[PDB]
Amino acid sequence: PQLGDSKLGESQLGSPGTLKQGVEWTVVVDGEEQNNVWDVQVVDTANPFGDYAVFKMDDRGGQAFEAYPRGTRVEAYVSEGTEPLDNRFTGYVVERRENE
Amino acid sequence: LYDAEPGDTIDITIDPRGIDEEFVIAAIEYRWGVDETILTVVEKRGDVDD
Amino acid sequence: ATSPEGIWSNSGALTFEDPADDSEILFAGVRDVTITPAYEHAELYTIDSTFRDEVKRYEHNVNVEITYAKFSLEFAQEWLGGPGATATASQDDSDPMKFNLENVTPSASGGFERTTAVENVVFPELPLDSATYGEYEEYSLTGSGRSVTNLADTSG
Amino acid sequence: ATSPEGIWSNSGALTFEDPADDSEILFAGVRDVTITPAYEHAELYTIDSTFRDEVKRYEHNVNVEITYAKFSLEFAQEWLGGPGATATASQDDSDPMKFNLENVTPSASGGFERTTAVENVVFPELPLDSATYGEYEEYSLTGSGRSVTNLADTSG
Amino acid sequence: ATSPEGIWSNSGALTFEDPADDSEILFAGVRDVTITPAYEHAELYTIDSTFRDEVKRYEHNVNVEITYAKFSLEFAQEWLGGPGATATASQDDSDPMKFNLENVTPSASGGFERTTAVENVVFPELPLDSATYGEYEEYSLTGSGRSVTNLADTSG
Amino acid sequence: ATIDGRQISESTGRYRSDPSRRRGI
Amino acid sequence: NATIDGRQISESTGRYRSDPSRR
Amino acid sequence: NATIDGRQISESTGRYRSDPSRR
Amino acid sequence: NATIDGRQISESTGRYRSDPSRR
Amino acid sequence: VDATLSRGGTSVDIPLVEEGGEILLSSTFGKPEVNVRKSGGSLNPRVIDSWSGLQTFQLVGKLYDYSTSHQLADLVKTASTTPLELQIPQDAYPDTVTVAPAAGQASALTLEYPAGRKDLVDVSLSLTRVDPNSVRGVGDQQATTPTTTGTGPVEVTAGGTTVQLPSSGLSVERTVGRPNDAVRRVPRQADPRYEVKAKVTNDVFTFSFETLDNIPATLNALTDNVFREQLGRDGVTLDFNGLLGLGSVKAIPVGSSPFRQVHQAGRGWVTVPTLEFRRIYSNE
Amino acid sequence: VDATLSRGGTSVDIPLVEEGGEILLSSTFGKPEVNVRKSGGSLNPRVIDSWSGLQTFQLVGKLYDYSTSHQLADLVKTASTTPLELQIPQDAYPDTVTVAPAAGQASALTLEYPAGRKDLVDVSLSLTRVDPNSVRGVGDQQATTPTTTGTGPVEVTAGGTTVQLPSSGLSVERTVGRPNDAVRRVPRQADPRYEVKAKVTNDVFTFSFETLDNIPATLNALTDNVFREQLGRDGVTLDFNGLLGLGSVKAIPVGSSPFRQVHQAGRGWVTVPTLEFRRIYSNE
Amino acid sequence: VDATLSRGGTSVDIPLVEEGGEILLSSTFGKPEVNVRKSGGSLNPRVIDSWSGLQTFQLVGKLYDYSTSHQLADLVKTASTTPLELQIPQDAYPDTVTVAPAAGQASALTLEYPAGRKDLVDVSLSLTRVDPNSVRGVGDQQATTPTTTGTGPVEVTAGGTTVQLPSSGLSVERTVGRPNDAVRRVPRQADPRYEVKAKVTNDVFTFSFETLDNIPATLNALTDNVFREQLGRDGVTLDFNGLLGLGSVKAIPVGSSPFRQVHQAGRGWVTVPTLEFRRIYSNE
Ligand SMILES: [Mg+2]
Ligand SMILES: [Mg+2]
Ligand SMILES: [Mg+2]
Ligand SMILES: [Mg+2]
């Protein structure tokens, strides 16, 4: 359980938790994590072609739109299973778009 | 293949297409949601942008 | 309260009335009468229990069925005509003749007099001829009233 | 354990109660009484056998049916009135009158006294008039109770 | 093999047992007993023949129906209670009381003794009161057993 | 199912120009 | 009814359909 | 089957589909 | 579900839909 | 026993009672977000399971007053960041689940007021399970069903003409839903995130009746003033005049089949199987 | 009793008789052209209603003559700018309405000639209401059903082989429609505009029968010559030989399921549930 | 009596037997590739028939042992360029036809093992006629069903926890298909070309049961461990433990509604109408 809720000896430690499985991408904007990401595309490509990333997020009252002015730092980290986070993309914002 | 970069070499076997080779990676695209790693092999070449 | 008591069938007086006038439609020679108020009962059961939780009434009617042995031209021609009308032929209209029905029966040893009154009794079909060799013509009506308007002791 | 014994139909005393007050609703002149607790049975089978795996009870009711020959105004007006009320006319509401029922019957050789108690008996239809030429009015109730509340030897 | 012989109904000893203890549940006064093992038969027909190709069995049960004239408080309260319990009221649970049934019957001129044993007989409904004017109460059980455990000549 | 050619071409324009924007002009 | 970025790509052809012969 | 300005945009893949197992 | 040259053009919008009210 | 649906201070009890062998509760479990590979060189596909699952509850029951039915409609239609909590009276479920009206659906709630029944409303609820801590939104829109105390007929007013709907065979159904709310996948939670949107909802009234007398006049008045006229930005005023305790709503018939006149062989009257009205802007 | 469908001097009376409580006349009113806003910051949508409505008539009835049945099919299929006028025997409808065969449909008219049922033809008609003054077009194309006075079997000719269809359980269905006609929205008025196009129509013959004797030969001849051959630009000659008064038509079976051989357990014969033919180019 | 389905050495006899008047064989003939013009200035369209037709066989039968059932599943799922031959015991067909499993379908073979039945399996097959000489491909992939001689309950293992499925009311359905094989049009001949692909097949196990005892514990174990966890690339072990002679497969529940819990009025237990599992990568 969480600390403070187990009467000692009453519960198995760590439960109801289990090992991470699946792929998780986290997006870091100027050093802060973006919570409401639901899709990520990252392209890494040889010299004639531009490396780019597209992040798709849910927003409320335009609050997240304000976090991504042009030129702001964005990092995409990936982890599959219990493997440590790899920084797979670093870049800067060129376009923020919000639509219905 | 989150470790992989363009310029790296990879073994590819596709029996339906008679491929069994080492190729250079020209590009990688990672897509969440669909869980796809899209390897461009040998050379990337454009369209209207070219 | 009144004691439950036997009722003798032959002591009944059945009257039919036009609901417009409250005028008597001539009817006689009954042999059987059944009056049955009814509702559709929904018997409701819950998720985790074998037992019934509720039962609710809907869709009220009074089943009226009468057997009789005397033919009434008035009753028949009123049925044919529909509301407010008398006819000697089938009418191509959608309005059935509504009858007000009342049955008055004394109890077998005089404890009460039972009046049953039923509004807007309609009959889907009318037996005109009901002949069988060596018998008097016997007529069976099945019908539905809207509601019971009176069920009371009507002794003095 | 009590030896199985014959039961004589004419020895049975049937009483009806309002579930609110536990007051008697006057009822007499019984000729037939069937009381049957019933469940639906689901018979369940496995994948590699012709034989039954399990059988399970669902959807409980008590089938009550009574034939009687003494008319009760109280019983009829209680049915018309719905819960906690009496009426002389049909009521336009969705709550049916629930009755508590008790049948007390001695065994033929006095070995035991069978009390059957049934809760929340409802009758979808009430026979008011049930006349047949040359007969006393005989009334049939078919209804469903929620459960059997008591089945015991009440001699002591 | 044993010569076929007449069987006289009044000679049958019917006994009910609890499958937990193999203890006798007191039962008497049988008037009719029908025991019938049954399977669903799939009668299978083929591509252009009119004749039946094959037939297969696919859902076994034993139909048990009993008419009896002596009321058992044990049998009734065991039925109410479900497996391994006795109750004076309806139980809101999904387990029906399973009975082991055995009938023993001599043949009419001593050729054999017919023993029929049926496992896990369950009755969807139990008649508690079955009153008709001028008669002893007659109770009808209908139910299904899982299988016939024994059909043999049990004579010495 | 009738598809509007102006709607498709106008909606996709953002994506058609993007490879070029990635490469300069 | 089909959308790209929430805009409809279906044409507003004002052509009617009405349900076929019952059979 | 879809159309832009009356021309079919569906590919004439000469590929068969046939009815599934009944169940 | 729609494809151009075997690749899906349906957007993987992570939006749920669930069975309508029964009536 | 009885199922509670609540949002803060507001609470509605739904009896979860039905006749005989009817389905009271359906719970569907889904993995809509698994990628099963459509191709590849093996006999069997590779898969990946990397997102929240679906749980859907379909609740069927009956309500014993109209007031509670309107409260249920209001509760379902309301846009609020306060969790909608569901209490299921069956041991296989936790005491409370946080829910959204069905995730993309026009019909989350169906209320039926059938003919010949009094104080007995059929309820069908479709609800999606969501993460209790991931109810996200900015807007707040309290829904109100208009209520009044009359006895009068159902009146359709358009272009200065009022049409009274026949009482005969009169059956009413209301569907309510929130299709503009987003229920979205989350990486490593069991349950999705609920984006509450202060946006357009679904609210539809369906009537069925038999037209018995003044038949041409009644049907013609409706079809002349509603169907053969351009209603503009406005619509029909649909007034219940206190039937079911309901008041006055602004509406329009939508689509290809909102009204139907049916003539059957041997019958001297016209059946209306559907007269369907969607509620329009008036909540200013 | 009768409904009259007419175009200039051509007039067909349709009895509008049916059994029991079957639906004889359905009229659907709609507003396909209302814009209801899918989104927006209101609880309830804004709407705009700016265009013509929709009125659809569905007529079920019977005809007592095959000659009249062919006239009805010819009348429905014909391209002409002369109004198709419908007279309905019910007071809710104006004495005449201008109609198009159902707007987008391949199936405006169904005529069934069932087994048994001598001189009884089942009619189903779908018609769309159009503005009497807004019937527009260039071409006249008179549709003729080929008619002859023989007794002979239904014969199917392809590639010099002729197959006689079994009389046993024989049912015929004909389906007619005009999907290439435009029914178009207009502002400011009640009814749409009808654009009559001298273009391809739908005309389909469906057969149902039971093959009782010479089963391999009969079925093989049809399958080998029609289904296993390429027919090219030409097709199949479908000759009725005077059954129902019908003659010779050029047709082809179209699609995935135009023909089925059904074998049932315990039966010594083959059922053909459908054999479906579409009429091809033949007028010069 | 029996239809023989075979591929070289491997042969299965399917008894074409069913109850009463059920359909044992349906053969559908089609022309999927006929071009019928949508328009043109004619009344009737011009056509062109240039390609192979379609013949679809649907076989309903019954198998009398589980061993033969598994052999049939393996025969249908196998990728091999050895022709699959169908011998039909009816005179309207040639002695052998060459077949593919249904051309684009997830369900070519359905096998039902219903409750109450021993040594009796329901078979539904859908097959497409292909040119004997046009069976083209590279790869052999031998399908095997894992078999064992146990008696144990059906077990579902996910994340270290095993659930035992109730024996009560237990039914199994197995669906097999080859949707990734291409059946393709060829000019100038009757039958299409079969491209055998050593690629992903469809293999689905569906279960139906009643949960009678330890109801929360049983259902919660399944829903917690299978549905509310992320399974990753790995999935669920589905082990038959020798029921029907079957063993252990790796699987996952796929889609929007693979599991349902059903609660009915007046019942003390939970129905599971469906629990669906698709077989995932295992086969080296
Ligand atoms: Mg602890
Ligand atoms: Mg753990
Ligand atoms: Mg790079
Ligand atoms: Mg680059």
**Dihedral, G18, G20, H3, H8 alpha carbons, nearest 10:** -160
Q: Do B48 and F19 touch (CB under 8 A)?
A: yes
DSSP state of D125: B
**Overall size of chain B counted in residues:** 50
Partner residue opposite G17 with nearest CB, options K103, K173, K185: K103
Contact flag for F and G (3+ C-beta pairs < 8 Å): yes
The residue of chain I with its CA nearest to that of L260 is I19
Question: How far does the centroid of ligand 3 lie from the alpha carbon of residue H13, in Å?
Answer: 38
Chain L residues near residue C46 by CB distance under 8 angstroms: 265-266
Chain L interface, best mutation among B1, B13, B15, B32, by max L CB count within 10 A = B15
Partner residue opposite K47 with nearest CB, options J216, J219, J235: J235
* Element (DSSP H or E) covering residue F7: helix F5-21
Instruction: Report yes or no: D33 and D12 within 8 Å, Cβ to Cβ.
Output: yes
Interface membership of L266 toward C (CB under 8 Å)? yes
Question: How far does the centroid of ligand 1 lie from the alpha carbon of residue C68, in Å?
Answer: 86
Interface membership of L281 toward J (CB under 8 Å)? yes
Instruction: Report yes or no: E112 and E2 within 8 Å, Cβ to Cβ.
Output: yes
CA separation for the pair J69, J111 (Å, rounded): 7
CA separation for the pair C103, C152 (Å, rounded): 11
Instruction: Report yes or no: H18 and L104 within 8 Å, Cβ to Cβ.
Output: yes
Main-chain dihedrals φ then ψ at residue K71, nearest 5 degrees: -65, -40
Interface membership of L269 toward E (CB under 8 Å)? yes
Query: Across the strands, what pairs with E153?
Result: E114
Q: How many Cβ contacts (< 8 angstroms) between chains D and J?
A: 9
> How far apart are the CA of D58 and the nearest CA of chain J, in angstroms?
9
Q: Do L17 and E93 touch (CB under 8 A)?
A: no
CA separation for the pair A60, A51 (Å, rounded): 29
DSSP state of J131: -
Say whether L67 sits in a helix, a strand or coil.
Answer: helix
Q: If we measure between CA atoms, which residue out of J148, J146, J111, J78 comes closest to residue J282?
A: J146
CA separation for the pair K181, K189 (Å, rounded): 20
Q: Do L20 and E45 touch (CB under 8 A)?
A: yes
Interface membership of I3 toward L (CB under 8 Å)? no
The residue of chain G with its CA nearest to that of A97 is G5
* Element (DSSP H or E) covering residue J48: strand J47-48
Residue A6 labeled ligand binder: yes
Tell me the Cα Rg of chain H. 14
**Dihedral, A37, A41, A47, A48 alpha carbons, nearest 10:** -120
Partner residue opposite L43 with nearest CB, options K143, K219, K231: K143
Question: How far does the centroid of ligand 3 lie from the alpha carbon of residue B2, in Å?
Answer: 13
Q: For residue C108, give the amino acid letter.
A: A
Tally of CB atoms within 10 A around J13: 17
Chain A interface, best mutation among F11, F15, F20, F22, by max A CB count within 10 A = F22
Beta-carbon contacts of residue C10 (< 8 Å; ≥ 6 apart): D133, D134
**Overall size of chain C counted in residues:** 156
Tokens of J75: 């509760």
Residues, CB within 5 angstroms of ligand 4 (ion): A 45, 49, 51
Q: If we measure between CA atoms, which residue out of A18, A30, A17, A37 comes closest to residue A78?
A: A37
Residue whose structure tokens are 């399996």: L121
The residue of chain L with its CA nearest to that of A16 is L224
Burial of B49 (0-12, 13-18, 19+ CB in 10 A): middle
Question: How far does the centroid of ligand 3 lie from the alpha carbon of residue A45, in Å?
Answer: 5
Say whether K167 sits in a helix, a strand or coil.
Answer: coil
Query: Can the peptide bond before residue A16 be classed as cis, meaning omega within 30 degrees of 0?
Result: yes
Q: What is the resolution of this structure in A?
A: 2.6
CA separation for the pair D124, D118 (Å, rounded): 17
Tally of CB atoms within 10 A around J67: 12
DSSP state of E89: S
Residue whose structure tokens are 């689905």: L204
* Element (DSSP H or E) covering residue J210: strand J202-211
Instruction: Report yes or no: J109 and J179 within 8 Å, Cβ to Cβ.
Output: no
CA separation for the pair J143, J73 (Å, rounded): 8
CA separation for the pair K247, K240 (Å, rounded): 5
The residue of chain B with its CA nearest to that of F18 is B49
Beta-carbon contacts of residue A52 (< 8 Å; ≥ 6 apart): A43, A91, F22
Burial of K13 (0-12, 13-18, 19+ CB in 10 A): middle
Say whether E100 sits in a helix, a strand or coil.
Answer: strand
- Output the CA–CA distances (angstroms, integers) from residue J155 to J70, J148, J236, K216, L7, in the order listed: 19, 14, 10, 67, 73
Tokens of K194: 């009808």
Instruction: Report yes or no: L192 and L54 within 8 Å, Cβ to Cβ.
Output: yes
**What method was applied to determine this entry?**
cryo-EM
CA separation for the pair L169, L257 (Å, rounded): 20
Question: How far does the centroid of ligand 1 lie from the alpha carbon of residue A16, in Å?
Answer: 11
> How far apart are the CA of B17 and the nearest CA of chain F, in angstroms?
30
Interface membership of C51 toward E (CB under 8 Å)? yes
Say whether K221 sits in a helix, a strand or coil.
Answer: helix
Q: If we measure between CA atoms, which residue out of K176, K164, K129, K185 comes closest to residue K237?
A: K164
Q: If we measure between CA atoms, which residue out of J96, J133, J101 comes closest to residue J3?
A: J96
Instruction: Report yes or no: D147 and C51 within 8 Å, Cβ to Cβ.
Output: yes
Tell me the Cα Rg of chain D. 19
Interface membership of B32 toward A (CB under 8 Å)? yes
CA separation for the pair K72, K6 (Å, rounded): 9
Q: Which of residues 97-116 of C touch D (CB under 8 A)?
A: 103, 105, 107-108, 112, 114, 116
Instruction: Report yes or no: D53 and L167 within 8 Å, Cβ to Cβ.
Output: yes
**b/e per residue, D5-16, with b = 16+ CB within 10 A?**
bebebeebebeb
CA separation for the pair L243, F6 (Å, rounded): 60
Interface membership of B31 toward A (CB under 8 Å)? yes
Helix %, strand %, coil % of chain L (to 5): 10, 45, 45
CA separation for the pair C78, C18 (Å, rounded): 9
CA separation for the pair K14, K121 (Å, rounded): 11
Instruction: Report yes or no: L201 and L241 within 8 Å, Cβ to Cβ.
Output: no
Q: For residue J157, give the amino acid letter.
A: T
Distance of CA D147 to the CA centre of its chain: 10
Residue whose structure tokens are 């070219």: B50
Partner residue opposite B16 with nearest CB, options J35, J41, J48: J41
Q: Do J35 and B35 touch (CB under 8 A)?
A: yes
Which ligand number lies closest to the CA of residue A11? Answer: 1
Q: If we measure between CA atoms, which residue out of E23, E20, E17, E12 comes closest to residue E121?
A: E17
CA separation for the pair E101, E36 (Å, rounded): 13
Q: Among positive and negative, which fits the CA dihedral B28, B33, B34, B35?
A: positive
CA separation for the pair D69, D30 (Å, rounded): 6
CA separation for the pair J274, J256 (Å, rounded): 12
Name chain A's partners: 3 or more CB pairs within 8 A: B, F, G, I, J, L
Beta-carbon contacts of residue C21 (< 8 Å; ≥ 6 apart): none
> How far apart are the CA of C36 and the nearest CA of chain J, in angstroms?
18
Q: How far apart are the two ends of chain C, measured CA to CA in Å?
A: 16
Residue A45 labeled ligand binder: yes
> How far apart are the CA of K104 and the nearest CA of chain J, in angstroms?
13
Alpha helices in chain K (DSSP H): 66-77, 215-222
Query: Across the strands, what pairs with J3?
Result: J14
- The CA-CA-CA angle for residues L258, L261, L262, to 5°, reads 125
DSSP state of L149: -
Interface membership of D3 toward E (CB under 8 Å)? yes
The residue of chain D with its CA nearest to that of E125 is D38
CA separation for the pair J262, J271 (Å, rounded): 5
Beta-carbon contacts of residue J279 (< 8 Å; ≥ 6 apart): J203, J204, J205, J249, J250, J251, K44
DSSP state of C126: -
**b/e per residue, A22-37, with b = 16+ CB within 10 A?**
bbbbbbbbeeeeeebb
Say whether E144 sits in a helix, a strand or coil.
Answer: strand
Instruction: Report yes or no: L271 and L262 within 8 Å, Cβ to Cβ.
Output: yes
* Element (DSSP H or E) covering residue D68: strand D52-68
Q: Do E49 and K263 touch (CB under 8 A)?
A: no
Query: Can the peptide bond before residue A84 be classed as cis, meaning omega within 30 degrees of 0?
Result: no
Chain H residues near residue K256 by CB distance under 8 angstroms: 17-18
- Output the CA–CA distances (angstroms, integers) from residue D47 to D50, E114, K30, L169, L208, in the order listed: 8, 33, 53, 8, 10
Residue A10 labeled ligand binder: yes
Query: Across the strands, what pairs with L63?
Result: L121
Which ligand number lies closest to the CA of residue B7? Answer: 3
Alpha helices in L115-223 (DSSP H): 215-222
> How far apart are the CA of C114 and the nearest CA of chain E, in angstroms?
26
- E strands, A1-100, are 23-29, 32-33, 37-45, 52-57, 73-80, 86-92
* Element (DSSP H or E) covering residue J219: helix J215-222
* Element (DSSP H or E) covering residue E67: strand E52-68
Interface membership of G22 toward J (CB under 8 Å)? no
Residue A22 labeled ligand binder: no
CA separation for the pair L153, L167 (Å, rounded): 7
Instruction: Report yes or no: D122 and D144 within 8 Å, Cβ to Cβ.
Output: yes
Beta-carbon contacts of residue J170 (< 8 Å; ≥ 6 apart): J115, J154, J207, J208, J209
Say whether J244 sits in a helix, a strand or coil.
Answer: helix
Which ligand number lies closest to the CA of residue A16? Answer: 2
Beta-carbon contacts of residue E133 (< 8 Å; ≥ 6 apart): D9, D10, D31, D32
Question: How far does the centroid of ligand 3 lie from the alpha carbon of residue A44, in Å?
Answer: 5
Tokens of J149: 């105390």
Distance of CA K3 to the CA centre of its chain: 18
Q: Do G13 and F7 touch (CB under 8 A)?
A: no
- Output the CA–CA distances (angstroms, integers) from residue K101 to C24, E92, F2, K67, K179, in the order listed: 57, 62, 22, 20, 9
**Overall size of chain A counted in residues:** 100
Tally of CB atoms within 10 A around E112: 17
Instruction: Report yes or no: I12 and J117 within 8 Å, Cβ to Cβ.
Output: no
Instruction: Report yes or no: C58 and C39 within 8 Å, Cβ to Cβ.
Output: yes
Chain E residues near residue L90 by CB distance under 8 angstroms: 47-48
Question: How far does the centroid of ligand 3 lie from the alpha carbon of residue B5, in Å?
Answer: 7
Tokens of J136: 């996200």
Tokens of J154: 């159902």
Instruction: Report yes or no: B48 and F16 within 8 Å, Cβ to Cβ.
Output: yes
Residues, CB within 5 angstroms of ligand 3 (ion): A 44, 51
Question: How far does the centroid of ligand 4 lie from the alpha carbon of residue B8, in Å?
Answer: 14
Instruction: Report yes or no: L158 and L235 within 8 Å, Cβ to Cβ.
Output: yes
Q: Do J263 and K25 touch (CB under 8 A)?
A: yes
